[PDB]
Amino acid sequence: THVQGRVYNFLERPTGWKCFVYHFAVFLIVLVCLIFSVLSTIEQYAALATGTLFWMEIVLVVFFGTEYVVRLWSAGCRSKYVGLWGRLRFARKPISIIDLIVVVASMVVLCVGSKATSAIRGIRFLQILRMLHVDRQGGTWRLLGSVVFIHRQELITTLYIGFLGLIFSSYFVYLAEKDAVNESGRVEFGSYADALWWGVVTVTTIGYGDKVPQTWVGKTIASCFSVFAISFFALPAGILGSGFALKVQQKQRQKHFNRQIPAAASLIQTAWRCYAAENPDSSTWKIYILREHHRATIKVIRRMQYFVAKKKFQQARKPYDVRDVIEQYSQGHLNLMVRIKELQRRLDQSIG
Amino acid sequence: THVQGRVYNFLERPTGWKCFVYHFAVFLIVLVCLIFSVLSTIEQYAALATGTLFWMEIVLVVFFGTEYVVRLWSAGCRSKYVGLWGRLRFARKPISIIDLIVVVASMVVLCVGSKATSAIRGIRFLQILRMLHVDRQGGTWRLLGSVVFIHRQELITTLYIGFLGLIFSSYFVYLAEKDAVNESGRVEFGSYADALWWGVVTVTTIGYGDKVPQTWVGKTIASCFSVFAISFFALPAGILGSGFALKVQQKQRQKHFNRQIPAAASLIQTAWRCYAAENPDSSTWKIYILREHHRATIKVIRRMQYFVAKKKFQQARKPYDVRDVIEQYSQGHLNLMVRIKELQRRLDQSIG
Amino acid sequence: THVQGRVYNFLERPTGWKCFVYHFAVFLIVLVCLIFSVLSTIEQYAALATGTLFWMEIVLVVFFGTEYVVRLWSAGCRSKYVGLWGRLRFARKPISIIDLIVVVASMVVLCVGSKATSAIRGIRFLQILRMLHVDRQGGTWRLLGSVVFIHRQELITTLYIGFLGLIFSSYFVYLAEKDAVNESGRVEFGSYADALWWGVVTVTTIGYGDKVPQTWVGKTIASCFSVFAISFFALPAGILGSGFALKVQQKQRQKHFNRQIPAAASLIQTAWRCYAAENPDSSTWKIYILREHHRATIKVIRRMQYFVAKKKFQQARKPYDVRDVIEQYSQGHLNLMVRIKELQRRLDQSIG
Amino acid sequence: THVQGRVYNFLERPTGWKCFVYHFAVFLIVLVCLIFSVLSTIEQYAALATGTLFWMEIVLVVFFGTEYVVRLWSAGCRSKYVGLWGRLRFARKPISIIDLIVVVASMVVLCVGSKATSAIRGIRFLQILRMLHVDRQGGTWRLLGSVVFIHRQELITTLYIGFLGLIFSSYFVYLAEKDAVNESGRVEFGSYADALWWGVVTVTTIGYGDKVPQTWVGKTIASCFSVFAISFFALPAGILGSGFALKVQQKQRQKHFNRQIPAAASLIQTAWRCYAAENPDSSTWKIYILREHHRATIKVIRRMQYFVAKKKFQQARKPYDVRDVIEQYSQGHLNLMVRIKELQRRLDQSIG
Amino acid sequence: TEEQIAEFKEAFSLFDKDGDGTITTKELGTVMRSLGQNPTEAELQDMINEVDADGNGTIDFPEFLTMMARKMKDTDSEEEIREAFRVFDKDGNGYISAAELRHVMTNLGEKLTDEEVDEMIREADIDGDGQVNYEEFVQMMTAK
Amino acid sequence: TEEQIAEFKEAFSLFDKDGDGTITTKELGTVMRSLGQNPTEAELQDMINEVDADGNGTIDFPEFLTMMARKMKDTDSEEEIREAFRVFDKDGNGYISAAELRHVMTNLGEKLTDEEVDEMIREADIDGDGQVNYEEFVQMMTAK
Amino acid sequence: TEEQIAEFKEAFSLFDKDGDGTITTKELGTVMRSLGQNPTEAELQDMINEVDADGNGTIDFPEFLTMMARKMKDTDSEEEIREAFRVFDKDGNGYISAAELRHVMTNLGEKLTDEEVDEMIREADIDGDGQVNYEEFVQMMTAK
Amino acid sequence: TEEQIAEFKEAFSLFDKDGDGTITTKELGTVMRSLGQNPTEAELQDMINEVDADGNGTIDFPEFLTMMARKMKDTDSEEEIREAFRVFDKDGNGYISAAELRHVMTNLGEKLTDEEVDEMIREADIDGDGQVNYEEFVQMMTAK
Ligand SMILES: [Ca+2]
Ligand SMILES: [Ca+2]
Ligand SMILES: [Ca+2]
Ligand SMILES: [Ca+2]
Ligand SMILES: [Ca+2]
Ligand SMILES: [Ca+2]
Ligand SMILES: [Ca+2]
Ligand SMILES: [Ca+2]
């Protein structure tokens, strides 16, 4: 009854300790195979590793093929992945396309080889590409995309400033060191191509030194460039670190999952009622209780209820802030004004 | 009727997808021309690119001249840019001055060339200078200026500490390595000029190595300098990254644009009333309703209304904070104290 | 009466100025001995330091042995460290195990030597390992572990991105520079092992230069790699610096220690009452005042009181936030609604 | 009448535009003299600058002597600097001591020279030391000291981790590369002194390359060290940048200067009353109105008023937070409970 | 369309019933209590804060046109409705039972009548399997 | 100027009408209701919080001089008034219509009388084109 | 266990005494005041906010089963109880006196009767030394 | 000292006048109104929140000893008093006038009587120069 869900949880979304350790073991053995293949080219393991490359290759491709097949079969648990169309939708995902491409390339290269260096390198490429499959919740790619999307104008501005600064600095370096000759007669700055290479080396602080200015004015302008533009080079690390820190800080102010249940239920009910407003022969009109022209009024009431439910839904997804306190105080003050006014009116009536 | 506004939106402020992709295509083709001109000096494209430099140069200068002309003509849509004086005000802008200087230099160099290396380099300079025209909302220069203005004393303090630290460190390096001779007999630290160059290389972590101390005391003082002053070198990146992060964090707590409309309207009305207080023969004095010396009182009332409207305007531009909650609670508590006191007085009168 | 507590405070947890300066002197003399042993191998102090190594070694091992013995004897002050089992629990701590291993290795090497280079190096290793004993509150290791635990998914994501980026960049570097030969005929990139070494040098910005690409495409891909992946290399410093800054910022919003005393006392009382609910013959049942089936009801009441006390305890450990204001306003509004309703009912009864 | 205050403002605390530009001109001319003296040693200005060194030296020492004399004379405006004792207190300040030492050293060296390289270097040292006099509000040194004081345990922990990590990494590097020989036969790692130098170069990312491991295990351990400990090297920049950012963020939530005036006045009054409680023959005892043993009660009342004023003073210096809202709501709720109880009692009495 | 504008015009006139050109919370509460909807100031403020885009606290004709310029078939609309179905999906495996839906409808919201509960269990049912195909349900909510 | 100080002196005396030397919200409300301005504690606190710079909650003579030392022609003043005209400029293209200005004046604020609405449409009009030259309007607000 | 479920069933029925299937603050206050526990709305909200996990504001049968699925012997439970004993440990040296415990019990909480104060001083006492072995006390709280 | 402890003992007994061993806001207000100090709940909470260090809301004997263990001559005390004199020093040049001090004393706080205003102007005066030597004033506040 739940075998498909159980295998889907075991494969796609490991959790706890059993499946977590199993996936960790798979990842570490994959990394061990990758590093052994890296060391294979060196003469220490030139022969044995290459001789054993085919065995591990076929074993791994069989394992990943079976894993892909069982995952695709278990994809039917998801409602959107039910039927042939749902299986195609699951396969059309970028990760599924990557996996199928990797396995088909692996089987092609293995069958061609059975009966060179580029093929082995492509094997490593497909292994490290399939290695990306461990990303299941999108916690790397989707998270970085969201972070970029939040700060698009900021990164655009910072990159713009950085490129303009480095371009002007490289032009100044070239004009200062057109005839730059280092010790023992080499033209280090043969052109502004060399100037640009020195500038990018300086901003990245590599300091290779193949193109170093030999004039005092060149040293001063290089120092000014290092002061100005290297900060641009160091920006994104601190920027996204601060972003992660503030996200974690705001991670402590979310409402409990049961608080949004009433809002979700109310919005579902209002959406259904708005949809059913198109059904004149419904029997739910008299529940509120003769009615000829009030259908438009009922439609408007349902529409405004749906809008209020939408507002509640947007409020549910956002954390606590000053707005909630403001609206709570406003509603309480309005209630107590209304009650005091009612009491005043009743007392004025009573006193006579 | 709206053709001037439409062309102004198309040129100055592209948005959506059509104009956005058009401007992106213009920017990318400009960058492609720039990189091809960069590669022109190398022998791979020494002849063909140089032969085709004039054609692309004249085409581009014609395109930017027409663009500048149409933008200046469409500038009349803005109220401050109406008439000859308004056109001059538009032209007096730094960006307009930059564009006109670039186009006039381009046409001058093209007409002189038609009937050398420095001219071509100036062509690249004006192309990359006109490239700055894509900045329209000031999101780079105005934003960096504002960020600096906010933290002027902080950057002043940090730079002061950094320069003093590097100066003392360089002096210590020189006094430790006055007779610094590296392997195979070269005086790496010929002077404290060499010491300063080594210090700036160390603080920028270039590590060229042309002037490296050869004594243990020199190594220790260099390590202390690297520990102390390189943090100064790395400051501004993290500082402005944190600034951007906090700005984005505060970007979520702005009131809706319709909330400041009443404050703006009220302040406009109060400003007009204060201005019209100088008109004794106005007919708006009796709207509040015989009046000889009350004109000064009405002027004071209008002035205090204008001050209250100014306070509302300053409150509108700032985000939510504890002050709004404090004042809301204070006004509610005062209202309910007043109402309870009125009820107590009325009940005491009634009981007798 | 308090001699054990006094010596425990003097040894384990120095504070004030006397013990603080004593521990600082011990730490600085330990560091001085370590640096003198470091300088011992150099010919400046090759003979005298080595001759005096045994004396300082035996003096130090005696001092640390006596210190460990007295600390273990004074460990009986702690309730969990009372008796032989408590002494074993104190000894089973990682720090105690480290200390006993260090002292036993020291006495073994000293007795073997009394009647080489590796032994001396192991002596330095045990000295620097015992140097870690100054960590008493766990402020280094426990703090870093907690910081990692808070941001486990973030560091996992960032490291994943960094390794994948560097791997692809190194592969691109190798494919671009398979035949990389530098000046005067050396194959700098003999393999993708060399490519990986150059990539890690670039991402760490060492810039040794033993393997530098000599092609324009290689320079461009290296620049792209430096732009992309070096930010990953610089992440953790800024990440944990921001974490420390936000922790210090939140350090100002803790309630006074006396505020959690009532919650702690209430939860202790509720826990004892829940435990004693299993004792039918208790005499505390009639304090609330015949009772046959109400024991289950009393157990449920005690259980819900214990749950409320647990909620109060979790509230005590967390700093101030919007939730406290929300619940305070809710309780006040409910109280005043209830009071106004009671007043309305009484007045309606009175008016008749 | 105010000439002393005017000259004190002109000298010690320039503000506005006149004195600000004057001080900026003084600072820039001092920097110009410093850079010209720096360039003096180079043969470009070896003769002219040295010949003109004495003239600028005597002019500057006369200017700073007159400035110090007039500042000391004008120090009498401050109440704490009134009289000979106050002048000594002004002179005992570190900045005043620095200035007097600089001027006395300058006059000594000038009178000795009138009737070598070290003397000139000491002249530069005293010029750059007097250059620190521009710090008047302590915005550099006091600010950095306060920032350190806030985060003492954090910097202690981070430095502890960094030194331990680099020490273990250097030991691993030495044990891996005891016999490290680079190309063409040089022992780069002659000892763990060389290993420590390579480690500090790597953590500072200098990359001089004089001591680079030649083994794969050495490269791997160096990569691990770069991953772990360089973040420690980059910490303080981001840490204090985040500190400055949060300080500027909190700079927007201070109460107006007039809000703390009532608290200051109340605390001054309570302090005086507590002091005057020791004066039995005062005539202020009967203002509150026979009184023999009530003097102790009045002393206790004055003491508790002083404590309340102290609480108000501590509240004034701290910015807005949740505590103010909590206490305001508590006092309002208590007031309205009290009023409702009074109304209920009066109505119950009236109904009969 | 012009016909849509006219429809909004008579809808505004009917919902006003005053002729002032602006409709207030008092009038909205009056018409609801005439229908028998026992209104609340909470409902009144939940109405003011979002529809009244001008911010004057009333319901003007241009305002009403602006809020009737809405559209319920927006990509954001089906995205948020899909997330809402994901909100109460406790399992997270794409399986949703009709029993919990019935319990939620009956015990929360407007306390759905048995008639509309039967409507729920009959419209959202793939041959009464108990596992509703909520993606097509979202599609035919959006399709209207 | 000394004459300006004297003018402020008799203005303070007239606005006091008590001789205590300090003027309170009670007296300000009394004089407004004598004029017929139906005051509110909200207006009273909006007065106290900004003018009363000393912070004692009253209106003293030196305080009144400090608030009369103001100036409405400040660079910040025309900058903020220009931004205020930019606040309701929905198009953002520098085009402002008189119809929206009339609607805002009539339906918000003091509910401008038709007389002052006509004053608006006649003073701010470049030959009645409907596109007011708001920069010169700002200039002649500041010029007073 | 099934017997545990049945026990919870009759406990829910007895605590309801209404047969509606949901138990409210009114009924809980009624039963407490029948016992004589002088309830308070503060106690009522302290009950609603934590046990009522569904969020409907009442006490349903599945809710009651969910809150009875608790366990007091959790590692978090003894950790928090140990920290609680650490809360009032002013010395911080692992020494706790019985006099302060007696004073706290008598002057705070439910104002412990002398009988239960004697129970405290007799159960938590290593031969009446005054230094209670609070670790074994925590263990035998958790052991129950 | 033991004599100081005894003095605190009879001070606590006199301020209690009830014999319960704990003193409450009701008793403190009663004794003040017997003296004629027209107390306020604001004063009562300003008393509870700081002196009552235990947190029980009353005034116990050990609590009273803890708050009498205070000392007014603390380095923090003269530092904060010096900053307080710096708070109203508008000029910031170390010059303080007696006129502003007199105005503040008369118009703020307890509304100092002319007798204590004369006491201020006579104690804090270097031969009546109007520029008080506030550093020695701080010293002889701390010296008591
Ligand atoms: Ca109409
Ligand atoms: Ca009505
Ligand atoms: Ca007067
Ligand atoms: Ca009045
Ligand atoms: Ca039942
Ligand atoms: Ca009841
Ligand atoms: Ca007593
Ligand atoms: Ca009383």
Numbering used by the authors:
A (entry chain E), B (entry chain C), C (entry chain G), D (entry chain A): 104 to 218, 223 to 396, 506 to 568
E (entry chain F), F (entry chain D), G (entry chain H), H (entry chain B): 6 to 149
Task: Show passages lifted from the paper.
The KCNQ1 Kv channel, also known as Kv7.1, is the pore-forming subunit of the slow delayed rectifier potassium channel (IKS) that plays an important role in the repolarization phase of cardiac action potentials.
The intermediate structure places R6 and H5 below the gating charge transfer center; R4 in the gating charge transfer center; and Q3, R2, and R1 above the gating charge transfer center. In the intermediate conformation, the residues that bind PIP2 are displaced relative to one another due to the movement of S4. In KCNQ1, membrane polarization causes the S4 helix to displace by one helical turn (~5 Å) in the intermediate structure and most likely three helical turns (~15 Å) in the down structure, but the S4–S5 linker helix does not move appreciably.
